[PDB]
């Protein structure tokens, strides 16, 4: 049975959330592959199927619980179980399709959405960009209930897509970027719910390119600059791994060392 990490929004603190994200990172990768001080997720080539996934069980005040499945090679949310039903994003290719049949094998009902979990499509379905979907403990609390009641018929599709956007950012992206974990910590500490600003969005949009630039860097320098936005949306370019070491927590395997 795949490793399970638990988190509850009920009585959640900055510390309980940080403990959660750190536990997720610890199950995504051994951390034995470190490039320029930044740990790398396992290479998909050579990774046996019984180590492909981790499970994140989320609970809230209503004692509703859902279990997200994360692919350890990229930390992304592949699908989730609620009760006797599992739901999966549409796979890109038949290899991803085969992998997810190893998830929630005893579940009674398995549903595959027609759409993938990419941000553009989710924002279309939710009817809102990430810039207009508030994040925080409250939103996560409401996302958990929405995911749960999808299986009973009480969650409509736009609400479901919004809830994925919230879960993916507060779990997957926070796992990938300690900056994003810091952004979620700040919201918890100031009892705030608020959408991500461009500094969060451009990081989320650039994880793969940042991981490539770092792993292919020489003497700390990128082959070509990567452009990000500040909080005010103004653009700036990163040329050096040193700027990103306090920002990125995990990289996808892009190259060998």
């Amino acid at each position: 049975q795949y490793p399970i990490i638990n988190f509850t929004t009920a009585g959640a603190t900055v510390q309980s959330y940080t403990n959660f994200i750190r536990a997720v990172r610890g199950r995504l990768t051994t951390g034995a592959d470190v490039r320029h001080e930044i740990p790398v997720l396992p290479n998909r080539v050579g990774l046996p199927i019984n180590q492909r996934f981790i499970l994140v069980e989320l609970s809230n005040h209503a004692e509703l619980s859902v279990t997200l499945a994360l692919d350890v090679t990229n930390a992304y949310v592949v699908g989730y179980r609620a009760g006797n039903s599992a739901y999966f994003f549409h796979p890109d290719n038949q290899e991803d399709a085969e992998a997810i049949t190893h998830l929630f094998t005893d579940v009674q009902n398995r549903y595959t959405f027609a759409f993938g979990g990419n941000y553009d499509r989710l924002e279309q379905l939710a009817g809102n960009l990430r810039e207009n979907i508030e994040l925080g403990n409250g939103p996560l609390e409401e996302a958990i209930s929405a995911l749960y009641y999808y299986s009973t018929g009480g969650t409509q599709l736009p609400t479901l897509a919004r809830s994925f956007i919230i879960c993916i950012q507060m779990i997957s992206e926070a796992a990938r970027f300690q900056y994003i974990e810091g952004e979620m910590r700040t919201r918890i500490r100031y009892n705030r719910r608020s959408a991500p600003d461009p500094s969060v969005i451009t990081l989320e949009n650039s994880w793969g390119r940042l991981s490539t630039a770092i792993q292919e860097s020489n003497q700390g320098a990128f082959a070509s600059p990567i452009q990000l936005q500040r909080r005010n949306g103004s653009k700036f370019s990163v040329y050096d791994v040193s700027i990103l070491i306090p920002i990125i927590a995990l990289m996808v395997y892009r190259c060998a060392p």
Epitope: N74, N118, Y119, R121, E123, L129, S206, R209
Partner: nanobody, 116 residues
Framework: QLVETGGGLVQPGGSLRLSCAAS????????MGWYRQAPGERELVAD???????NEADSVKGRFTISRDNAKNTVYLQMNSLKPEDTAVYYC??????????????WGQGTQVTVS
């Protein structure tokens, strides 16, 4: 899998319209956009998500207008009030991926734009 149209040489104040259509494995297609590089760095001109988010370089705000036809997986760039500083080779750019936003990246062949 990217077919670009457009490009040319204009005088200051002239206008060009670029287009680039994507075909193939673009189930999880995300943001399409345009980069430019002049001789001697490559810079983002504009991109647009399928959901309506637009990024644009300050240099071209109010002059260039990017738009997208999601059914055709095609992005257009209406370049009006062109200036000599807009001279460069322009590339369309296509991001895609279910697992993360920029998992897949495809570059166009580049078309020359010159203003003088």
């Amino acid at each position: 899998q990217l077919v670009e149209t457009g490009g040319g040489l204009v005088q200051p104040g002239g206008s060009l319209r670029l287009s680039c259509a994507a075909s193939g494995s673009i189930f999880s297609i995300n943001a399409m956009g345009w980069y430019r590089q002049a001789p001697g760095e490559r810079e983002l001109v504009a991109d647009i998500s399928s959901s309506g988010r637009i990024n644009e370089a300050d240099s071209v705000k109010g002059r260039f207008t990017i738009s997208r036809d999601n059914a055709k997986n095609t992005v257009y760039l209406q370049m009006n009030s062109l200036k000599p500083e807009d001279t460069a080779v322009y590339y369309c750019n296509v991001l895609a991926g279910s697992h993360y936003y920029d998992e897949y990246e495809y570059w166009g062949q580049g078309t020359q734009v010159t203003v003088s």
